[PDB]
């Protein structure tokens, strides 16, 4: 099973990179988005606590979530 | 669409990671207790008692830890 775990971690790192590039290109404002989403999930609260600077937490937040200020963050 | 595409791929990665770590008998709660002081993602994952697979995945990606055999 260990090859599968390692493979999935590799795919996660690739997705995080792709997500960072795509949201940056769309001018996502993480702090305004996360202020709106923080009460909605544990991931969003954690992402706001890191000021939006932790892309894996930003990604988990968006995947978990009509929020104002989230244009370009999807 | 590029952001939405990445989000779709993320959901597939989370499913596979859950299946793979379960097949590898990952002991999430003990692993996260060992890692919780190491990163914001790990402290958040422990706060959800390991039940939040996206937070578990972010923790493992960000992090000699006891109990983490099969989680990485």
Numbering used by the authors:
A (entry chain B): 1 to 65, 69 to 77
B (entry chain A): 3 to 65, 69 to 77
What does the report in the manuscript say about this coordinate set?
The most abundant virulence factor secreted by Hc yeast cells is Calcium Binding Protein 1 (Cbp1), which is absolutely required for macrophage lysis. The mature secreted form of Cbp1 is 78 amino acids in length, has no known domains, and, prior to this work, had only one known homolog in the closely related fungus Paracoccidioides. The Cbp1 structures displayed an alpha-helical dimer arrangement with an intermolecular four-helix bundle fold at the core formed from the 3rd and 4th helices of each monomer, creating a binocular shape, and thus we dubbed this new arrangement as a “binocular” fold.
Additionally, we have previously shown that the Paracoccidioides americana (Pb03) homolog of Cbp1 is capable of fully restoring lytic capability when expressed in a Hc cbp1 mutant background, suggesting that Hc is not the only species that could be using Cbp1 to elicit host cell death. Mass spectrometric analysis of Pb03 Cbp1 revealed two signal sequence cleavage sites, which likely explain the doublet on SDS-PAGE. To resolve the phases, a heavy atom derivative was prepared by soaking the Pb03 crystals in K2PtCl4. The structure of Pb03 was truncated at C-terminal residues 65–67 from chain A and 67–68 from chain B, as the remaining amino acids were not resolved in the refined density. The asymmetric unit for the Pb03 Cbp1 crystal contained a single dimer, whereas the asymmetric unit for the H88 crystal contained a dimer of dimers. An alignment of the Pb03 and the Hc CBP1 dimers gave an RMSD of 1.6 Å, indicating the structures of the distinct homologs are conserved. The Pb03 structure has a clear negative charge at the C-terminal end of the protein and was partially positive at the interface between the N-terminal helices.
